[PDB]
Design a protein around this ligand. Sequence first.
Ligand SMILES: [Fe+3]
Ligand SMILES: [Fe+3]
Ligand SMILES: [Fe+3]
Ligand SMILES: [Fe+3]
Ligand SMILES: [Fe+3]
Ligand SMILES: [Fe+3]
Ligand SMILES: [Fe+3]
Ligand SMILES: [Fe+3]
Ligand SMILES: [Fe+3]
Ligand SMILES: [Fe+3]
Ligand SMILES: [Fe+3]
Ligand SMILES: [Fe+3]
Lengths: 158, 158, 158, 158, 158, 158, 158, 158, 158, 158, 158, 158
Amino acid sequence: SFTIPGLSDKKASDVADLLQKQLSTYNDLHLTLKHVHWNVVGPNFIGVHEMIDPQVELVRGYADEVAERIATLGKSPKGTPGAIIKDRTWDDYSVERDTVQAHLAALDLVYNGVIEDTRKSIEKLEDLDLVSQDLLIAHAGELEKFQWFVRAHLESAG
Amino acid sequence: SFTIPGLSDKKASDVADLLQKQLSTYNDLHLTLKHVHWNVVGPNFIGVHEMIDPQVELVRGYADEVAERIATLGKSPKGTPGAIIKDRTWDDYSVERDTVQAHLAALDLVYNGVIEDTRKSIEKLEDLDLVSQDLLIAHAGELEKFQWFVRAHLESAG
Amino acid sequence: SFTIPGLSDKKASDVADLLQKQLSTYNDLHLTLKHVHWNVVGPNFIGVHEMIDPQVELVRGYADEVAERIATLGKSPKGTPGAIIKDRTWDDYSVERDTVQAHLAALDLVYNGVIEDTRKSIEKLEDLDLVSQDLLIAHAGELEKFQWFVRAHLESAG
Amino acid sequence: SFTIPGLSDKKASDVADLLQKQLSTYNDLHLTLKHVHWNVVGPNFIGVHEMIDPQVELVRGYADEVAERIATLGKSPKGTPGAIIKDRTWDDYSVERDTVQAHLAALDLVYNGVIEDTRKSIEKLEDLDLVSQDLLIAHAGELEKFQWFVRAHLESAG
Amino acid sequence: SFTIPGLSDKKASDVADLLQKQLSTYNDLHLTLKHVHWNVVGPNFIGVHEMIDPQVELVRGYADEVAERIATLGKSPKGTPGAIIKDRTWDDYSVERDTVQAHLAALDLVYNGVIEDTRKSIEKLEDLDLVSQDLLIAHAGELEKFQWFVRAHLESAG
Amino acid sequence: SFTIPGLSDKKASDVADLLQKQLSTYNDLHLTLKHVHWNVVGPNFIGVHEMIDPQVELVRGYADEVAERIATLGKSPKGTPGAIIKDRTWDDYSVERDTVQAHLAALDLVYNGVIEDTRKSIEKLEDLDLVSQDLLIAHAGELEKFQWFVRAHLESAG
Amino acid sequence: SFTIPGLSDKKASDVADLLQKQLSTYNDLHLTLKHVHWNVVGPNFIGVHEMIDPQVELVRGYADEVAERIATLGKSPKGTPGAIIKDRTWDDYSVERDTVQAHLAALDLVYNGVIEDTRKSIEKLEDLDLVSQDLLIAHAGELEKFQWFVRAHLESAG
Amino acid sequence: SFTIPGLSDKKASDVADLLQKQLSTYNDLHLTLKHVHWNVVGPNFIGVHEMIDPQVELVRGYADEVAERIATLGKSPKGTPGAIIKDRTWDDYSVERDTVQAHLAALDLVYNGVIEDTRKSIEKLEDLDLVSQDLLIAHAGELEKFQWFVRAHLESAG
Amino acid sequence: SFTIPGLSDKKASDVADLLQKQLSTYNDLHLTLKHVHWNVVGPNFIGVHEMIDPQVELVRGYADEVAERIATLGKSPKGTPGAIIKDRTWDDYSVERDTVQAHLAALDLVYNGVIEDTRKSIEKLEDLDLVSQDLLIAHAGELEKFQWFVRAHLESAG
Amino acid sequence: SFTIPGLSDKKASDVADLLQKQLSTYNDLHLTLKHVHWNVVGPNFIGVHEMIDPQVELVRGYADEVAERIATLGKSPKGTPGAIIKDRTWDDYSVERDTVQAHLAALDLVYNGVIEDTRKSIEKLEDLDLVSQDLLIAHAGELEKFQWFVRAHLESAG
Amino acid sequence: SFTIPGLSDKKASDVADLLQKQLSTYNDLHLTLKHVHWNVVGPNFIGVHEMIDPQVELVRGYADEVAERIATLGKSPKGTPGAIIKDRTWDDYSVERDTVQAHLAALDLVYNGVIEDTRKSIEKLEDLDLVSQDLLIAHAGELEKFQWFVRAHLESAG
Amino acid sequence: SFTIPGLSDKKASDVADLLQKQLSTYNDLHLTLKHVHWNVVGPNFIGVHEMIDPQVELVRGYADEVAERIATLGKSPKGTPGAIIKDRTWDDYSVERDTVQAHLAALDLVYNGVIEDTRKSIEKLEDLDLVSQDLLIAHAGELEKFQWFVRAHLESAG
Ligand SMILES: [Fe+3]
Ligand SMILES: [Fe+3]
Ligand SMILES: [Fe+3]
Ligand SMILES: [Fe+3]
Ligand SMILES: [Fe+3]
Ligand SMILES: [Fe+3]
Ligand SMILES: [Fe+3]
Ligand SMILES: [Fe+3]
Ligand SMILES: [Fe+3]
Ligand SMILES: [Fe+3]
Ligand SMILES: [Fe+3]
Ligand SMILES: [Fe+3]
């Protein structure tokens, strides 16, 4: 029944609730990333196929980071196939084996919903815990950037 | 509509169906592993906590391996939070934050069901595809071994 | 008689005074960490013994970081056995050779006083220098986390 | 006039004859791989160009492996430009500088004939030498997989 | 015509304009750094000569960082010798081959103008995009620190 | 007022003048390379995007090399945004965010003017300084090669 | 009183008995290898002397591997100087300091008895446990290969 | 019939006799170490299990060291399962699979007999060969230290 | 229908023709090297066996180098088992499994014809392309050197 | 209530008392080293600044070494800010931010008092424990050496 | 009585004579370099002291290179303290322990005589052996460059 | 006019005189080692050729070690081709290009005179400086050992 020295047992628990969501969000994300890492096919196959691994090994990186943070706060992280399917507010990636274009486009949107939920979770944190914030921010930086990669693959002449 | 040169489009598809199951099995496993990696607590905490990461980075290693194998065969791997919750025949890890003992014991059983399902999938493969077999075997070796680690933490004087 | 281009010679000096405290705090901490790294004994000895080195090589890491920051500001860091025993507001670790439990519990508290003093120093910095803040924050993240490690070694069934 | 303790001087010699074929097969393969590594051109050039080196450094890896195995058996490996052009049952890669598509498609077939000849050589080995089998199998795993890479570059919407 | 999910197409474009400036600032800086890396001469030559490379390989590091961030936002980074000479509000380093003292002193000032422009750009960002802020801050930390190095080479007895 | 033991103070100064040009040429090149590294977009994005970094970290490599050579000769290298915009005889890259094709084609030409100016500078050096030649040659090898990469991305069926 | 999920407590114990023998076999082998690593002398000394270390660091590698496997099965590995001298069916290496030729020839035979005992143990395992087989096979591959090395040092013109 | 230039053919042979003993002592030790590395079981299993490998890879390190030293002296090292069982004056480790406590305690004693025999061999060497002494000393340092590790696992409140 | 900016479409094609020969020469060489790497036997076996790999991993290094150079020029490299057996003007290595002496001597000659053909190709290049020269030269340095190694194995008292 | 097998519980305790002093001596030293690492300023700043880190990471290296040695003996190491300020017989470094010359000179003396106290502690040990001696000696070698570095910065023409 | 295939037994022997001189030149140089590496003293001591090692480990690098080249040619390299003192045409470094300035100035001249003798040996080689030329050139590049380092330590305001 | 705190200005100078000799001894040694590294020829060439480099890079290692020690003491190391030819009491290696046997035998003796001179210098040091002793001892260990290597190449059947 402990907690970080400097946080009201209430603010603390509200942050937890926030991350627990982020965590399930990442677990879906990184599992989905690997999903496309497998079912992508096209002329510029390798390019993308390989481009995903890092973003994956990275998102999973944000999982241990967030969870290990939750436990630190006092609450107990949940990362079983169950907990995830519950906390999420979407339908798992609908694409099977398809073209590069297909996935990237679909992925574009997945990140939209991930960057958005994050941003909100950040702004909401500036009043709760600043630490758990610099943390979430950092992720945004790479999440948003990676998205760019996805997107740069779909543009026209400008 | 291709396939490995030397496999009947039927034997090939039957192997696929087999791995697709294994894959979902691993995804649960490795996600669950990380789950305990987070909610374990006790006197000999670190010991276990750290002991899990490798088995994890390893099981996820068997995921890319199996899936990338399925696609090679012709069928299309499915590794979304959805596909997994469906192909599985159990209830995701029921333990929240608990003692070392607790998890390890619980994990003991999880591996039972994983090693068993595997063994059977191996024997069943000796008639289908020998390659997709040496593959599944290798895993058993480490899966089984790791279990031992878990178990060695629960024994008595002999 | 210089200073960072953008800081009033007063705000600058007030930040210095703040870090100079943090610095002595770390020096005690990391010297103390190594202290227990030596006098710990018990059944799960190695676990802890080894678990400490990183947190140590890390806190000493925050020493060079903070001090090199102070000098940058204009004031002069003080890190002799003297300066530390003075800036501190506690009694150096009272434990000699004792059980794992003993130290970890005692250490739990030491970190309380370190995370607390830090948190306050952060909030107090948002008006002074934002840079010297992202800096202090970052540390909190790992300081707080490590504490968790210590703590996870002391819990019950929930 | 020696041989592995446990193999009839006849079974031994029959395995040799088998590998000696595999070896020349690899030598053609890896030399051919590098061939396209050079004459590929197109929009997604780099992707493929670079994708080939590893499969090459790998096939050449299977050369030393096989040959050093043959010598172990008692017979004498032959790997001169001559020996290869003789043991082979095909016409060296007919493509000069051409598109990505071109080579990959052409390569698809080359691997067909390599995976096929291998598979048969495996099944034929289960009665001769089990060791020289796990060996050939392993290769199949990567050979077959790489082919997939080639192929994934040629598919449609499903 | 896209943008980060959570930023008004206006706030987004205003941040871009801000970085685009920073970027040209860095390009001048790092090109200038290397400039002195070449024309420095004196008794304690090596010391400085070598001290610069890291700060260089680092500033160029902040270039890719900032620009790849701008593109992510939607606008298009400009980093040609042209774009830079335009966005800047100073006269390129006036020193040719000269003493250590000479450059360092001159460099002192260059950093003044870089840290200042940065600080302002940070404060101005707290209302626009927090992500693009933690980013700029981080740089300040090292920029400011390095300056210290330069400066520590010019002091008296206190 | 020194110089390499074996070079007439005149030949020496004429070589300097030659490199000083090369240097500014590289600085434009490498800055431009990074420019496209940022504004490229298309289906085979990653491929190219990543393909550029090495050639960049390499050209910047030829910068330190050439300049540090000039200083060795006696003259003083100039590598400020200024010096470059002056010594050059072209208009900085005209392409903003555009397709892969676009840039590569445009880049094709940029290298034309760089390999040409180089070649000439080599032939002209065989009478001046042989050392400063093997140096320039080496670069040609990689410069020319990289161009090939660019080009291989633009070809037809032969 | 546990065992791998899928093995009859009898088959399991029969495999154990098999490995326990292998293990003592390796321990003798690797201890013996080092023995010659020390007492070899001749014109081509270094060659051999150094050639042995890897095969050694490797056989000891098969020790931990086998034993850790036995424990996994349920029985208890025995690897004391005692257990070994008992399970073995030969007389420890009779050679003291002697020529290169001497040892290698003698070693030739030692490997005969090791590869033979292994082969049999493999064939005998195809009915018991397939895992504990791929394991023993793999070793054969390198054991047999190394022998070749030994042997290649003793041949004539063909 | 040679010897180190500076040692009486008698002193030399007496040192040899001394090391030859040490060597067999180590071989038992390191073989025994691995023995427990396998049969240890308990709650804090991993801790110890892993703690042993280094001390092992280390003692085996002192084997090559000592033996290669003996050969240097002129006599011929003996390191076969035989030689060891003879030179030793004890009964090989009596513990099978048992608790952590069990082994460590038992191991405690084993090291007693190893550090003791060593110490004496050192003092006895100060008159014979100083080199072969700094050598034996060094080992003591780590041997004794490791023992401490074992021991720290068995203590009470002081 | 392109070419290096600075080479007459004729000089360029004449250089190509020259390398294309060198390339086939290397392919034979490195394939032959590995050939002896396998069939060498004798007292000082290891010495040579291992001495070859580097020279091999090196000549294959000169293959990619030369070919990738040819393509750069405009012509299309040919490196199939076919192309090689044609461009060559000798009979592939006639030695099967034989002594160390045998091969080395035979190899001595092979290098004679490779160094000679090279030297000529160099002198012939000083008028064509200087770049494609420094390249060929470099190789000679190591080719010639390695030969020495071969040779040093065959000498008498002087 | 244990101790190294071969040391009288009295000699053992007398050695402890000796090291415990050394330890506090090092802790001051290394903390002081870092102190100057921060407050040094001058023309040849970097030179020294960087020259200190290694000696620091080294002295701290001698801390863990000594302490871990004390515990091995039986007594309990003390390394809190307290214990140190007590065991020492001097006044912590009196220099704040000053010139290079200043510190180095001051440091010269500090090492005098450290090398002296050490030397004496060595001679005094030759009768107590030889192991704890080779240990202290080794340090002297580097301590004394580093001093030289300090000193070489203060000399005249001879 | 052999020689590189393409060199007249006379041209070959004349090149040898040339290198044999270079070699003794380097041996003096690198031995001398280390000489100053030891006897340098001053305020900016470390800077230089450390600056020399690389140039040393590099010149010794040119020794093995040249000699191993001579042997390749047919003649026999001579690198004993004797051979060197003979082939040289100067008096070994006259400086004992002195200031930084002292040595560097003195060294300046030493390199003059080394770069000069080299340059001449290069020009003289363009008619003999081109290979043994690119080799000597390369060295010049770094020799000359390093000299610059030495020199940059002695200049004034321009 | 300084010296290690604890050494009489006389004892100190007598040690210096001792090392200064050792140093010249090493310089001859390591220069000579490389000498044979070049002129060795025979059937088992490579073996030895390569066996020497390490002992060389090692002896040169003992050079910097000893010299940097002398300077520490107060006197000034001398390591020019001159100083060496003077301090030595032998005739530089008399062997030109010869057989493996030749050199090794010759080298055998060289080491005799080096190990002997060393041993004596050690015994003589036990009364002067213990530090400068552990130092010299250490070397003996490897010097003596390496000799063994040389020697093991010359023995008979026992
Ligand atoms: Fe973790
Ligand atoms: Fe993958
Ligand atoms: Fe620092
Ligand atoms: Fe091989
Ligand atoms: Fe980038
Ligand atoms: Fe540079
Ligand atoms: Fe193990
Ligand atoms: Fe060894
Ligand atoms: Fe390539
Ligand atoms: Fe430690
Ligand atoms: Fe060499
Ligand atoms: Fe040194």
